[PDB]
């Protein structure tokens, strides 16, 4: 039908923004400590620890499956890599300090998105 495409071009103009949202959201790890997932060889009892682990490769790959149906999801996606690490790491170590700096920064990125999306609908 119309409609479904009309949607699709929707969802795909979501996923073009939600890209560049991901990329700002990215730049603010210049460590990359949020790149990719936390291996299981090398941190053996995690899932015991961390439910829902999250990282910005996981998100990368949902995304371009167009994925994410509107912003709220996708920052549940960005919610779940700092809460994890906030949980996981103790507050004297450069990994929870790298989550406070992301989560402080990315703030202002997701602020004006919110905008974008309620804009152009």
């Known amino acids: 039908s119309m409609e479904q495409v009309a949607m699709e071009l929707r969802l795909t103009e979501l996923t073009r923004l939600l890209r560049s949202v991901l990329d700002q959201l990215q730049d603010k790890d210049p460590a990359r400590i949020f790149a990719q997932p936390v291996s299981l060889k090398e941190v053996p009892d995690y899932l015991d620890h961390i439910k ?5 490769a996981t998100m990368r790959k949902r ?5 994410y149906k509107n912003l709220h999801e996708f920052e549940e996606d960005f919610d779940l890599i700092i809460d994890n690490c906030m949980k996981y790491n103790a507050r004297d170590t450069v990994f929870y300090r790298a989550a406070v700096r992301l989560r402080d920064q990315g703030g202002v990125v997701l602020r004006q998105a919110r905008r974008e999306v309620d804009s152009i609908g």
């Not at 829902?52 to 910005?56: G, L, S």
């Not at 995304?63 to 994925?67: D, H, N, V, W």
């Open 52 to 56: 829902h682990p999250m990282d910005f």
């Open 63 to 67: 995304l371009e499956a167009q994925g």
